[PDB]
């Protein structure tokens, strides 16, 4: 029933966990507790097999643990800065090589999978800091320049015309801009990891930088030069919608150091580089 399924959505009871059944004392040459991890399989033994359990009706649901839920929360992926210091023409516009690798929090979650396919919801939070007192009338322009399209080199470059590229104009005082993006890859899924190169020589590039080009996000303060200088910081937030992930992997155990690469750094005392806390000894809880 499309209506019964609706209720499960509102109550978040789409994926229920099984009940625990009453079990009894046993004496048998069938020993569930014994197995062989060498097989590479996980022993599927349940509590009813190792102790005498009572009957319990489970009410927990796995909804929130779904991939859609795990990767469906908007997190910051970039903090763009336009700081008017001493030259409006040079400082009133900028560009960013788009990627989901600069902020650790959302990066780590996506990287818990090898491949992921999803649509995106981008939400922007612009904030104008009044360095000299007033902010006047601030209007911003954000333009997506796909790889190949001309990148503006001045605040009045013809590229800002955006005759084809998508641009979003935001006016200070209006609500936060937001839009959706369809799955953008030329492949069937995004590579979270890529053990390959863009060539076969000692100078070929390695990693996702080869497969994850997303273009450039160009932005400028549309408003022409004003007496009082401002510093506009636009924070970009990303969220995955209609998600699918494949081949789960170990979580990032050390701090990230660069984009598109798994490189890391180690100190002379490695226990400081991982979340593992040194134990006094084997028997000290």
């Amino acid at each position: 029933n499309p209506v019964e399924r609706y209720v499960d959505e509102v109550l978040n009871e789409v994926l229920v966990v099984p009940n625990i059944n009453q079990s009894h004392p046993t004496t048998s040459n069938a020993a569930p507790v014994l197995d062989a991890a060498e097989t590479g399989h996980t022993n599927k033994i349940q509590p009813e097999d190792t102790i005498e359990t009572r009957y319990v009706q489970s009410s927990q649901t796995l909804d929130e643990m779904s991939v859609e839920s795990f990767l469906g929360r908007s997190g910051c992926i970039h903090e763009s800065v336009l700081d008017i210091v001493d030259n409006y023409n040079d400082q009133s516009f900028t560009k960013w090589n788009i990627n989901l690798q600069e902020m650790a929090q959302i990066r780590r979650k996506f990287e818990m999978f090898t491949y992921a396919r999803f649509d995106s919801e981008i939400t922007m939070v612009p904030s104008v800091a009044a360095k000299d007192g007033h902010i006047g009338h601030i209007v911003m322009q954000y333009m997506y320049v796909p790889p190949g399209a001309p990148i503006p080199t001045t605040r009045d470059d013809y590229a800002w015309q955006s005759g084809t590229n998508a641009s979003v104009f935001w006016q200070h005082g209006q609500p936060f801009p937001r839009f959706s993006l369809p799955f953008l890859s030329i492949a069937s899924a995004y590579y979270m990891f890529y053990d390959g190169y863009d060539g076969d020589t000692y100078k070929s590039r390695y990693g996702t930088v080869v497969t994850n080009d997303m273009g450039t996000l160009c932005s400028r303060i549309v408003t022409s030069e004003q007496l009082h200088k401002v510093k506009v910081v636009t924070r970009i937030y990303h969220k995955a919608k209609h998600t699918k992930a494949w081949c789960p992997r170990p979580p990032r155990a050390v701090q990230y150091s660069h984009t598109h690469t798994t490189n890391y750094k180690l100190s002379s005392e490695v226990h400081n580089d991982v979340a593992i806390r040194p134990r006094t000894n084997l028997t000290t809880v």
Partner: peptide, 29 residues
């Protein structure tokens, strides 16, 4: 663009824009 259900509990799954990317979070399983 509405997937009107009935039961009376009439569900109204509306898609405001004409792109699949535009809709909200997906259903489970």
């Amino acid at each position: 663009g509405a997937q009107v259900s009935r039961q009376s509990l009439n569900y109204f799954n509306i898609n405001y824009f004409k792109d699949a990317a535009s809709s909200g979070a997906s259903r489970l399983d």
